[PDB]
Structures are given as structure tokens and as C-alpha cells.
Amino acid sequence: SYVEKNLLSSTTGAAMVGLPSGGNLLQAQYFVTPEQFGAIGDGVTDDTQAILKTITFANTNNIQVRADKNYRFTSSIAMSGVRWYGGTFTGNGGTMISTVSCWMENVRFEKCYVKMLGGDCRFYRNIFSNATSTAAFLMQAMTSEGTLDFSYNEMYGCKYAILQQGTGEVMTYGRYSNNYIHDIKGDAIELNVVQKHYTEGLIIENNHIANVDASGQGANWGIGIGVAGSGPYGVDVPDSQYVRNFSIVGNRVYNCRQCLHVEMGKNFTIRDNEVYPNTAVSTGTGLTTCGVALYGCQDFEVDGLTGYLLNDPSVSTRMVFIDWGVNNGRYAGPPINFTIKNLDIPESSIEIATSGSDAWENSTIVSNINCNVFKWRGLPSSSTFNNIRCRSIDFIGQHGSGEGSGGGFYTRSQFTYMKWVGCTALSGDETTVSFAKIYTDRCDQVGNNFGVPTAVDGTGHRGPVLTTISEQYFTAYDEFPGGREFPTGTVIHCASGKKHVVTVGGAFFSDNEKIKATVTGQTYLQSNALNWASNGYAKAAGTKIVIPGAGANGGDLVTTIARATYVTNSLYTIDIADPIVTPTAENTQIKALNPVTFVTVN
Amino acid sequence: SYVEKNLLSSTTGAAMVGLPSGGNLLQAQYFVTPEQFGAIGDGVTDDTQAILKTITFANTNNIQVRADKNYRFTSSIAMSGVRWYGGTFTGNGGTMISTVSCWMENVRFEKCYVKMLGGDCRFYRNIFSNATSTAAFLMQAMTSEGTLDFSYNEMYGCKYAILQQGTGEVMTYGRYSNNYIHDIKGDAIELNVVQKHYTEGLIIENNHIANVDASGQGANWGIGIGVAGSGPYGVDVPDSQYVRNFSIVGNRVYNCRQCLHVEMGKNFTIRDNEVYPNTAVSTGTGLTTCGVALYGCQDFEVDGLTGYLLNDPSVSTRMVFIDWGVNNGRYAGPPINFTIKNLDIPESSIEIATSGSDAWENSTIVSNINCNVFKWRGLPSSSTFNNIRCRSIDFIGQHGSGEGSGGGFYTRSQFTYMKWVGCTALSGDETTVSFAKIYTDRCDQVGNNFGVPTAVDGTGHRGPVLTTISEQYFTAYDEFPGGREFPTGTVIHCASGKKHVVTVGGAFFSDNEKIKATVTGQTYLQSNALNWASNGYAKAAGTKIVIPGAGANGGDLVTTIARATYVTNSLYTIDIADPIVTPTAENTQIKALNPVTFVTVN
Amino acid sequence: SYVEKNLLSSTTGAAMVGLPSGGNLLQAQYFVTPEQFGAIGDGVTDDTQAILKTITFANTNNIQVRADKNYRFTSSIAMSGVRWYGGTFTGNGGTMISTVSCWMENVRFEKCYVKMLGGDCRFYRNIFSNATSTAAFLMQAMTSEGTLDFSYNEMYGCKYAILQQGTGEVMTYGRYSNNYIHDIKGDAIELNVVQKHYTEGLIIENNHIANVDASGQGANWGIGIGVAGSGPYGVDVPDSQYVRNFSIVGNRVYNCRQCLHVEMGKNFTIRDNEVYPNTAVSTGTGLTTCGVALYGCQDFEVDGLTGYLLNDPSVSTRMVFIDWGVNNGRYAGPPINFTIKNLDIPESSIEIATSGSDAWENSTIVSNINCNVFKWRGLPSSSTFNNIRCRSIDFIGQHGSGEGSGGGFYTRSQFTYMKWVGCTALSGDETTVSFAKIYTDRCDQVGNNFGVPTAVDGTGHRGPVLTTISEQYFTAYDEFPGGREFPTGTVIHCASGKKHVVTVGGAFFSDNEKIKATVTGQTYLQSNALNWASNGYAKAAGTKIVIPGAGANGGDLVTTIARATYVTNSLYTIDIADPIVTPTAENTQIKALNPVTFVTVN
Numbered sequence A, B, C: 001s002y003v004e005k006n007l008l009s010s011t012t013g014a015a016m017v018g019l020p021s022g023g024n025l026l027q028a029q030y031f032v033t034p035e036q037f038g039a040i041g042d043g044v045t046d047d048t049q050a051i052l053k054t055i056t057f058a059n060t061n062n063i064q065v066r067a068d069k070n071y072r073f074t075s076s077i078a079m080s081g082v083r084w085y086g087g088t089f090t091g092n093g094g095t096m097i098s099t100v101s102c103w104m105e106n107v108r109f110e111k112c113y114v115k116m117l118g119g120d121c122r123f124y125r126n127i128f129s130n131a132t133s134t135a136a137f138l139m140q141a142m143t144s145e146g147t148l149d150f151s152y153n154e155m156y157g158c159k160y161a162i163l164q165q166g167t168g169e170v171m172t173y174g175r176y177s178n179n180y181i182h183d184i185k186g187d188a189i190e191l192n193v194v195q196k197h198y199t200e201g202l203i204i205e206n207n208h209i210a211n212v213d214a215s216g217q218g219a220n221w222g223i224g225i226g227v228a229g230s231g232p233y234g235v236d237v238p239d240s241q242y243v244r245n246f247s248i249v250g251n252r253v254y255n256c257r258q259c260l261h262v263e264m265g266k267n268f269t270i271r272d273n274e275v276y277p278n279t280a281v282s283t284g285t286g287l288t289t290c291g292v293a294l295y296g297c298q299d300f301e302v303d304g305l306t307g308y309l310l311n312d313p314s315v316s317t318r319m320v321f322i323d324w325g326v327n328n329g330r331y332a333g334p335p336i337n338f339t340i341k342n343l344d345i346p347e348s349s350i351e352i353a354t355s356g357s358d359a360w361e362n363s364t365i366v367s368n369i370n371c372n373v374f375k376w377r378g379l380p381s382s383s384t385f386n387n388i389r390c391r392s393i394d395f396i397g398q399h400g401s402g403e404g405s406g407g408g409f410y411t412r413s414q415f416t417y418m419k420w421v422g423c424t425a426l427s428g429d430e431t432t433v434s435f436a437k438i439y440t441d442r443c444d445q446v447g448n449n450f451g452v453p454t455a456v457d458g459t460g461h462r463g464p465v466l467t468t469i470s471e472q473y474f475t476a477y478d479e480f481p482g483g484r485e486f487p488t489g490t491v492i493h494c495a496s497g498k499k500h501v502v503t504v505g506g507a508f509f510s511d512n513e514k515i516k517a518t519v520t521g522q523t524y525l526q527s528n529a530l531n532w533a534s535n536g537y538a539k540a541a542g543t544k545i546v547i548p549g550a551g552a553n554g555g556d557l558v559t560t561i562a563r564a565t566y567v568t569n570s571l572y573t574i575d576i577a578d579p580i581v582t583p584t585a586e587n588t589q590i591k592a593l594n595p596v597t598f599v600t601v602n
Ligand SMILES: C[C@@H]1O[C@@H](O[C@H]2[C@@H](O)[C@H](O)[C@H](O[C@@H]3[C@@H](O)[C@H](O)O[C@H](CO)[C@H]3O)O[C@H]2C)[C@@H](O)[C@H](O[C@H]2O[C@H](CO)[C@H](O)[C@H](O[C@@H]3O[C@H](C(=O)O)[C@@H](O[C@H]4O[C@@H]5CO[C@@](C)(C(=O)O)O[C@@H]5[C@H](O)[C@H]4O)[C@H](O)[C@H]3O)[C@H]2O)[C@@H]1O
Pocket: A076, A096, A134, A163, A190, A191, A192, A218, A219, A220, A221, A223, A226, A227, A228, A261, A262, A263
């Protein structure tokens, strides 16, 4: 009347054991484990065949796998339809596990990698550690269309972490969110030639990436997050060559040679990312150091960016780099129809190369920027520049050969529009801007601390020649205000009713100016003739001046007034931004860099 | 000395089996399974009663349920306090499972739906598939106050996915985050008449929604994400009728007739959503196609929007639609106190209808916009418009009957303020704006490529009559600059000291202008008399001109200069934006659309 | 031939039971449970020793723990390397569980707290309820370097929820995301003196916090989210004293005395948070009520803020408070190099106290703001103010002793720059601004509804004395436009060619103005002499006026025209913003607050 030794060991033996529910143990087997198929789980014993039987059994009976041990395996394993919770797989270094419609949580993939081959796959709260394959999580040549949620995983110690190659069946939708990827030697997330994919959306969001160092590795290795469509680049190539409708939002990329990269992307947004590039990592892989690098892209925004470069600024300050593509050594595919905005990168610089044509429109917006150098090439059909705080401007509109990517390639004889509102180029006391070849038919400009010159490409080609009057002042006195630069066209209205019109932009310094002798290294000047605390002979900080003979080897010294008139040692004094190089003798003149001409009415 | 066959099958039988811990199997029963209560799990056998006993046992003993099979059930199941992990429920199509204070993970609800009835409920990493009930996840007539975290679930194949009806006990807090909802025939997330709910917050964030097609379904079906308070609409109805303090952030809604909808919302934010409306889906359900539709709302912002419409633009370009509500065929409840900003939707259009009164203030801000048509009705007590790039402006301030929602209903005789700074209305070569009925006491305007006319509603009612001078220019020459439009009040300062004041805004074209004969379809004009490459007879691109007799049936052709003066075939030439319709003979005049009048001082 | 009673109970007994896989029950033991070590799980029996053996066994054999019951424990438990799923721990109130490299999910920590001591720890989907210890989740004196993911947990009923004390080994990286913290009596998230920590990043994002009420508790208790570096404060103290490179993004903090707090932070961002402060909670703990409070911080942005205060506005409207630090009763450490932008807080106020020096630069940006009072102290080396909508401005540049934090401490004689573009100070009909001590060398200002006066700190010290002309108007008539305020320097161009230049800013009211008698409480005035519907004697709403003798005790009444000229009862009428206090007799004069002086040319 007792249970037999046999039968209890049979495939129905658990049916003999009662449980508090009133059912039996056989009814409690909601899973299988690899140990039930012979796995040792010691991380050393070869468990490959045990794993294969588990997968076969789970597929055939549609039963989830539970595991907690460490399964050493030595050759490829194919999985289809499996739900797997827990455990560690330990490959040879780069051994492959393929998944079709697989759901995996709390798994550690040690010294191996997962290759997704199709279906609806889901990966949560896993660890991918120490892979020596090209990628730790690979999407390539899928045999059926896929969707993917790849979220809250941690990946480290590998080469590429997440890599997609766009051959095969399409991924229609993918979310890559809240992963933690660190201490790797390839890209953290690279989606290569995926223009056909992600029709219903690609979203790469809230990933935290740290220490991407591809030193000594292959070409292009070491990008933080990268998305690539298909060449050839070109302003008019078909929409189907581009990766479209995707977003890269809220990620953090620390200590990486090139944090964010897109080429041949269209209709996309790069929003609120935080990046810390470093010239010193991924040595030899050929990447241009920066936070955001975009090539040949159209119809996109960069909206919100923070961080700074970790290397010394003398090596690089490049943070935003928006450029043409290249086909076989020839530039092609200017970026067009884009918005750069809300960047908070005061230490770091922006470089943009675009274009404009009669054959297609290009409308650009740059807005709400805090940066270091703002460097720009190209003349869109319309370009607006609003609330840019920068430390210098390096700007050429219709740039020619030798003046930047695609110089000379396109021109636009039709209506060309530009606007500059509320911008500030200022570093300490210096306002440092350079503008050229702005062949605009209309240019509105207000609220800037500088004037923007526009140019004419052949007589009559941009309408009547006009100068926008951006500054007008009132003085309670009649004498022209000295020592302060005014652009051409500036009007001064006097309380008496007189008015001055500036016909050659510049500043007034009397021909009777005399300064005290100077010595090398001196950063102030003192008056030996005129009253610099009068309005007519005043000295305004920010004004560019020339001190004859005071520069290197007796050249003229061009400098900036750093502090306006004050009295010390009973003399009128100003400070200059650059020290005297060659000493000057008593009663040397000082002059404006740009001497004003004005006319007076009444 | 051997175990009996009986007793081992008893409810304590597992106590006889030793484990490596040194305990017994009975101590390892941390869960129950449905199979322990007779469930077959084959998806075909009716397991309803087995499921009910499981729920009873789990509730009574506070023990979690584990499952992995497929439980066909055929009538309603009520659950309270249950923690359930895994398995598939398969109903008849719309069979109900109710939950009170339930926690569910990794469950598939197939052909059935969950109805939440109260407590603190949590749903993670579930699938809701193929429901034929009205909603797949329903909140209605809760019998106790609730909180809800509904996150990282996938829902598809249903009618409504998530639906709340606000009757019963309140949901005090709810987070709906990171769900994937697709291929449905009702709304993806609809919270209807929930003004009493969400005192401690409603947050709808980072959901990815795709393919919402309610064609052939009931009224209003097919909204992407919708939130509704209670009628009647009205500017002064009680705060308690509104859904308040909620947020809709970071969602993606692809291929949906009306992606985001709020009515009777107050103190809310719609931030950084990406939407792709489509006129072709939800045929017959009566929705206005767009990305964001807001009715009767107050104290809100739309901050950040991307995407575009999937249908052909000839059918619709409507993306943002902010409008009054309607009570029984009468408009009521103008939107007031709102901010529209940071929209990146260059292909798509914005339509806003508001109002202003002496009885209440309405302060509006529209800022940092990239859009197609900007259409506006209504005159707030203060309205600011900053850094708007658009392709046309269609604007009426105090709009009357027949000119938009609520036209004529309210007026404001007190101080009314408006500002336009740094805006651009431009499509290729055309600046296309229409303004009327701007009855402002002060209007500041700078940095725009157009002038904003203000109007007076009865003599003296807006102070002395002033025209803001928005443009002033300098010329090195005395002749008036030809061929370029200047608003009324424009001042031209000459290097000689002369000045021109524009007393009737417009452009100068000499009465002696003669052009060569033209033929139908021609898009250029050539001079037969004057030197168009002189400043006085210049031709600026963007200027609107009239070619007598060249329009349809010999009407005048109003067009725009597309390219300023150039020489070809030894003649001064300009391009026009619109082709000649009716041919013109040699020595026809060309004129400004708006002929200038100016006076010259000196 | 039957199984023995013994042996089946042995540590290998499960090996005798067959399963459908063909393996045995021993191979299915992927976990241990506390009941296998003697735990009763009734929440009452002391299970402390049972828990300790479980931890020992799990550590020694590297096996996960599963649990579902309620384990009462009574003294500290140390855990290292454990993977624990499920169950409830119930301490004495504040009993400690320590973790080193622990992974915990679906656990409830009742009346106890977790103290993290190092390694890589992970906490998901847990509940921390009713702790009476100082904190429910404590990081302090870690014995090895840590990383932490603390996400999707719920915490309530405690004192501090999450607290870190920065002594011991560093946390190199931490993500605190998507938690739900409510009904607590300390801070929700407080990271105190952690300047050495988070080299690879600190990210606090998408947490929902509600009801933080530290009434009756210790000093500083009741902050929503707080991050603190190390004193002493000071503009030039070493970088190592600051918490750096962190972010506080997307959180919601409802009903809290001080929602967000940072002191001694550098290179950080506070982005898109929603906050609802309340003066009534945390009574006695000494916190300044507001949404965001920053002390002594540098190189940071506040980007995006919504919400409002829950108390009556008469008690407080303070929402943003950016201030110096304090060392031993002396202010020190001005905030420098910061950007305040994208704030949508129309009901609530902003208070900023900064500084500027020759010894270091300070570049500030305030942009795209909707607020109530905008209060500012301090004169940076460069400061820009763009698209600020506010209800009043309270501004002093180089503020002195008694005029705000750090008044008098620093001055900058070198180039000092300021810009105001497109700002609006307006409350109903009143434009209420106060500016002083703006000692700038250049100040660009356009598109505002007010003028910004700049000042000179000693003759000659800011260059020639200039007034920016911010407004110019055109009139079709010659008479000066009456009843409307114009800043000094305003130019009016007449259609006749005449021009008026405003030499003393103000408004024109004729000396022949006479009004009808008034009575107390009256809010309109009526003309008894002049035609107020003429341009020369016009009355513009918004103009500040003086009614002699009409204020309290026969003082002059200074008020604002609320409605421009209209006719009622056959008399020219205006409305005023403030009622008559002391009655005035027939034929009293009305005057401008600021009487204009102008000169006319021609
Ligand atoms: C050096 C290089 O590194 C990676 O590529 C980088 C980068 O260097 C490259 O320049 C490119 O950079 C992008 C750039 O073009 C674009 O302009 O900008 C992007 C930024 O947005 C840049 O990222 O792409 C990067 C990813 C490697 O991907 C790359 O590999 C490729 O070249 C080598 C030749 O040197 C090989 O030819 C690779 O070929 C693949 O190799 C696998 C493999 O595992 O062997 C094949 O797979 C299969 O066959 C094996 C055989 O064994 C069995 C039978 C088994 O045991 O199971 O099956 C195995 C496996 O499961 C099978 O799938 C692939 O089919 C094959 O395509 C080629 O990918 C290079 O190393």
C-alpha cells in the first residue's frame, strides 16, 4: 500500500505528491530547468547538448525555462519562441545564441552574444558581459520581420554592444531604452544601413553610456550612438536611402570619441542628450571628435544638448559638427531643412556646413544657443539666427572652393533671406565676428551686439543697395560721442535737434590723441593730451584700437579697450586686452582700428 | 519503514521530501498554480471554475499565482488582492476579469479584458491581445479609490485599448508609461469625464502608439490619447469641471486620425510628443484630423511637437487645432492663458481660435515655431508672438460673426497688448500675411520680415494714432531706392544728410517702366526702357508687382519678383513667381501692387 | 522495491521524483526559500535566524531566494551577493538590512530599511513602507565602490525615503528613475555631501513624489529632491567641493515645502520638472518655500518648469530661488555662469541674486520665461534677458549693502554687457518695472514694452553717455501725440517732414486739462475742457497719471489709465486702474506722472 521506487521516478511521478492546494506536484511544474536535461551548471562542464534539449523541449511544449546556475557552452544555439528567466550562459568568448520571438529576463550572457533573427523579441534586465564577438547583441539578416524592446539591460566588457546590419527582413519597430552600456571597445549602439527598417518607429532613449574606447580597433569603431542610411549621398537622392522618422532622446554618453552620429538620416530628432567627448579614446579609428556629428542629413532637429569635452581644450573643443557627405572623395549631400536649438554648451564649439540653390529650398533655424566658436559655411534659401550667445563667429555665406565642404557647388540667384535677432558674440571684452559673402535679398537684424554685413554678387542682383540701421542713439550734447564703434548707417539724435549720420562705420579718436610712453607687457595706456572723461574724447570698453609700432617687431598693435576711462596717478587711463609687445615713446598717437566718418545735419 | 502511498498525496505530503537546503518540499511552495485546482491549460477546455478556486485560494491565503499555460474561460472572474505571474487567459472575445488591488506581470489577456475596480493596482510587462469588448483595459465605477501603474505593457488587436469612465470612486494617481499600443480600432488611451480624478497626478508618458483605425466605428472613436473633463464649456465655469494638473509627455502616435485630444482640461502640459495624423483612418467617426486638438482648455502649454501628416497635403495639413468648445450648437469656452511653443512641424499648419474680454484676462504666448500655415482668430488681453517661422499668416484679432469660433462674443475695451518679434512668413520668394482688427493700445514689433497693421475701434479708443517704425535704412545715394517694398513710416537716411519718410507704404516703380512683350507661361520680364541695375529703378526679389492685363481673361496679374535684376540676351531681366496667363504687348508698364508715397527732407 | 521513508527526507530525496522533462525534482531547485530554513512567515514569529541561514546558504551556493510570506525580524541582517525575489520583511520600525552587490525585486520592506554598503546593487519593483529609521533606503559609509539602479520602486510612510551620506567609498554611477514616493516626513531623495561621488553620472529622473510633510521634524527636513556638495561656499573654491555632472529631469513633486534643492553643485542641469510647493508643510524645519532653490552653484541650467504653489498667494508665490551660499553668517559663493529658461510658471515668482567681478567672468542667460514677479540682484560680466513675460520687474544691477545677498562684495570695472530683447512686464493694464545701478558699457534693448535705464559709476567709466533709442513712431499729423508715455530719446517722424525728439521721457498732458468732480471709489474720469478724442490731447491706456489731491489724506493719486478715451453721458471718459480715495472738485487738473519734454525740428 506504499509507493513504488519506480513510477515515482517516471515522467508522471510528481503526480503522487500532495500539496496544500489539494493538487499535486505535477500540476506545479509551470517551467523547466536546464538541470532537468543534464546541465551541470558549474560554468566549466560543457552543457551545450543539455541546453539544446531544454530549448527543444521548451519550444515543443511551449513551456518557460527557469535557471540559476552557470551553463558553459561551446557552439551555436538556436532558440525560437522561448521564454527564459534567470541563469548565466558562458561561451568561448564570442559564441552565438540566436533568438526568434524570444523573451529573456535576468539572464547573463558571458563571453557570448545574442543574434536576433526575427519575430517579436523582448530583452529586459539582462547582463551582456565580456563578449569578444564583434557585437554582444547583433541584429543581422533576420529571416522574418521583427519588433524589439531592448530595455533596462546592462552591457560591458565587449566590443560593439548593440549592432544592427540592415540586410534581411525588416525590423518594423524598435525601442532601445534605459540601458547601461560601459567599458566597451566598439560602438555602444550602431544601426548600420537600416534605411528600409523602422517604418513604425525607432526610438533610442534614456540610455547611459560610459567609457567607449576603440583604441587600436577597426575603421569607424568607437561611436556612442550611431544610425546610418545608404550612400551615395546627395541632395536629391531618393527618400528610400535614408533612415527616417527615428529619435535619439535623453541619452547620456560619457568619455567617447564621437558621442552621436547620423549619416543619411531624414525626418529625425536628436533631443536632450548629454555628452562628454574625449580626443584620447578610439585612437586610430578615424572619427572626428565631437558630441553630435551629422552627415548628409535632411529635415531634422538637434534640440537640447549639454556636456563638454574631457580632453584639454587646446586639443579640441568640437561639440556639434553638421557637414556634407562624401562620395569617393567628392563632397555631396549638403544638410538642408534643419533646426539647431536649445544647446547649452558654452565651453564647446559648433561647425555647420550647408548650401543653397535655385533648384531646391533649404530653410535653416539656429536658436537659443550657448556655445564657444560658432562656425558656419553656406547660404540657405532662408536662414534664421536667434538668441545665440557665442564667443566668436566665423561665418561665410556662399562659400567658395577652399572655404569649406562643397564650396562653390551651389548658388541661389532667387530670393535669399536671412535674420539675426538678439545674438551676442562676446568673450570677456572682445566682440569677435567675421562675416562674408552674405548675398541676401533681405536681411533683418536687431538686438545683436554686432552688425552683419551683406554683400552683392554682381550689380543689381539683390535689389537696391541698402544698409539696415541697427543702432540709433540719443545724446544730450552735440559733440559726436568719442571712443565707441558705430556701424555704417548709425544715426545719433542730439537734444538740440542736430543729428549725426555715420557714413563709414567706426569710432572717433581725435588726431590730437597722445599717450604716455609704454613698456613691454603693459596692459594700460595713459593720456598725455586729451580729457578722456569728456564725451567727445571718451574711451569705451570693447572698442578695437591700434597702437602704432607697439606690436611684434614694431608692427602696429591691434587690441581692444578692456576698461573705459579712469583716473590713477592723476592721469586718465584705460586698460587694453593685449599687452604692449614693442615699447612706444611718449606722445605716440592712439587710433581706432576702424576710423569713423559721419556727417552732421544742423 | 517506507512512505505510504496515501499521506504522500495528502495536503502535507510534500513535507516528506528533503531538499539540499535541509528543508522539505512543502517549505518550497511559495506560489500556487491553476493546474493545482484542475485547470487543463490547453486553451480549449473551459477552465473557469478552476480559475475561480485559484483566486479564492490565493486571496484567502495571500499566496501568489504562477502560471504558464493557456486558460480558456467563459464568464466574468473577480480578483481581489492577487499577485499573478505568467500564463494566458483566453475569453470569448470580450469576457471580463475584474481586479481590486491586483499585481499582474507577464500575463497575456487574449480575447478578454481587465476592468479595474479599485485599490492599488500594478500591471507590468503584460500583453492585451484581440479584445472585442469596448476596451481591453477598463476603469469604470470603481468601488474604492485607486492608484495605478500601467507600464511596459503591449496592447493590440482590440477596440479601445485603455479606457476610463470617471463614475465611481476616484483614481487619485495614475502613471501610464512606456506602453506599446498598436493595430486597434478605438482609442489607444481615453480618460473620459475624469475631472474629479488624479488629484495627486495623471502622467501619460513615453507610450508608442501605431495604427489606430476606427473606420466604421462609433462617434469619436479613433483618438490616440484623449483626456476629457465635463461640460458645459464656458470661460467662467467652475474649476471642478476640468481635468487638472496632468501631463502628456514624450509619446509617439503614428497613423491616427487625431493623435492627442483634450477637452475641458486646465493647468496641464503637453510636452515633446511625436505625431503622424492620417485623414484616411477612422472614417465616419467625426474627428477633426490633426496632431493636437484642444477644446475649451485653460492654463496650459503645448511645448515641443514633431511629425507630419501621412496623407497627401491636398487633403489636409492640419497639425495643431486649438478651439472653443460647443454647448448645444453654440460655441462656448474660449481657450485662454496658454503657451504654444517649440513646435517643429514645418510641413503642417496651426489653427488657433481664442478671445479677449474686459471681464477676465487672457495672456497668450506663441514662441519658437516652425510651421506651414499659421492661422489665428481672437484678441487676448495680451498676446506675444516670438521667433515664428511660417509659410503664411492668416490672422484676425477681434474676429466677428462669420470669422471664426465665437466671433463677436467678447470684446476688450481696456488695455490690450500685442508683440511680434523675430518672425518670418516666407514660402520660397513670397511673404504672405493677412492681419485685421488688431485693436491694440500698444503693439511692439521688431525683427520680422513683415509689418503688422493695428486698427482703431472708434475714434480715440486706443490713444493717439501712431505707426511703429519697424524698418530704417541708410543709402549712400540720394535717389529713393526702387523696386522694394517699405511699410508706412519707414525712414531712409541718405549719406548727404537728406532723408526720405515713407507716408504710404509700398514700392517705387517709375511711371516710365516698359517691358518687352510676353507670352503665356513665361516666368521672366525684360526691360524695354529703364536701367533696372540702377538703385533708383532697381528690382528687388520679394516685391509684389502688377502686370496690366496679364492675368486670367485680361485681368491684372499680381505676382512676386522671384529673382532680382540680371542681364541675359543683352536685356535687363527679372523672374516672376507666377507665369503670364494673358499675353502682353511690347511696352506694357509694370507697377507695384502697393505704390509708395514718400516725402524728402532736404 | 519501494522508496524508504528516510533518504526521501534527505538532502538528496528530491532526486527520486520524476518530472515530465525526464529529469528529477532535485534538478528543478533553482532557488531556495526562507521556509526551508525554518521561517514561519506569519509576520509575528521572530524569523531572524531563519533569514540569516537563508542568506548564508544563498551566498555560499550562489542561489537565488524566492519568498512570498511575511518574515518578522528583530535585528540587523547583512546580505552580500544575494538575488532575492518576493516576500515581506517586517522589522521593529527601523531595523536594518545591509546589501552588498544585491539584486532585489518585488520585495516589501515594512518597518525596516535597506542600507547599501557597496558593489553593484539593483532594486526594482519593491515597496518600502512605514520605516521609522531616518531613511528607508540609506547609502552611507560604503565599504566598496558602488553602482546603483533604484527604479520603479514605491516608498511611503517613512521619514527620509532615499538618503545618501557621502562618507566612505564612492558611488561611481547611480540612476534613480521612475520611483513613486509619497506621504513621508523627511526628504524624498537627499544626496548629502556627495561631491566625491558620481564621476560617471548621477541621474534622478521621472520620479513622482507627493505629500512631503516634515512638520515638527529636524532642521532642513522636508526637501523633495536635494543634492549637496561641501562647504565652504565661495566663487573660487576648488572644483572638488562640488557635486558635478548630474541631472534632475522630468520629476513631479506635489505638496512639498521646497521641491528641488541644490547647494555646491556645478556643471548640472535641472530639466522639465513639475512642482507644487506649499508653505504649510514641514513646519519649523527652516526651509525657504519654493519649487527650485539653488545655493552657491555654478555652470548650470534650469530648463523647463511647471506647477504652482498650493497655499494662498498672500502667503508666498516664490517658485525659483537662486542665491548665494552662507559661511558662518556671511554670504559667499554667488551663482555664476548659469541659464534660466523655458519656465512656464505665470502665477509664481523668480528671485535671483548673483554678482560680477573683474577677477572672473559670469555670463548669465534668462530666456523664454512666463512668471509673476521677476526679482533680480547682481551685475554679471554679461547678462542676457530674452522673451520674459512677467507681471513686474524688481531689478538692481550692482546692488549694494542692504540691497540683497552679497551686496557690495564684488564690482567689475571692465567691459560689462547686458541685453533685453522681446520682454513684457504687464499685469492687466500696468507696466511695473524698477531698474537701478546697471553700470554697463553696452546694453542692447529692443522689442520690450518698457525701457531699461543704464547708469554710470563715475564720470567716463562707461564710455560716452548714450541713450539707446528703443521706440520710433510715425504720425500723419504734426501735433505731438498726447497721453502716451515715450522714453527719453524717442523720435516721432511726421508726414510733413517735421520730427519730434523726446529729451525728457514722459507723456504729454496739456496744462489746460480739467476733469469733472469725483467721489470716493470712482474708477473713471471725465473731461470738462479738452477733446480727449483728438491726437494732441489723446489718452492712451497704460499711461501713469497723477490726480492732485485724490490719494489717501489728500495726497496725490498716482494711477494708470485702464481704458482709453470713450464717450458716455455725452462726455469724454477714461477709466483708471485705482479708485479715487479723497474726492476732487470740478476742474481739477490731471497730469502725467512723468511729464514729457520734446523739441521739434521744422
Ligand atoms: C572592421 C569591421 O568592423 C565592423 O564594421 C564596423 C566598421 O569597421 C565598418 O567600417 C562599418 O562602419 C559604418 C560605416 O560604414 C558607416 O558609414 O557609418 C557607420 C556609423 O553610423 C559605421 O558604423 O560598420 C561597422 C559596424 C564589422 O561589422 C565588420 O564586419 C564586416 O567585415 C568583415 C570583413 O573584414 C566580415 O566580412 C563581416 O562579415 C560577417 O561575418 C559574420 C560571421 O560571424 O562570420 C557572418 O555570419 C555568419 O557565419 C558564421 C559562420 O559560422 C556559423 C556557420 C556558425 O558556427 O553558426 O554561422 C556563423 C554566423 O552565425 C553567421 O551569421 C556575417 O554573415 C557576415 O556579414 C562583415 O560584417 C568588420 O569586422
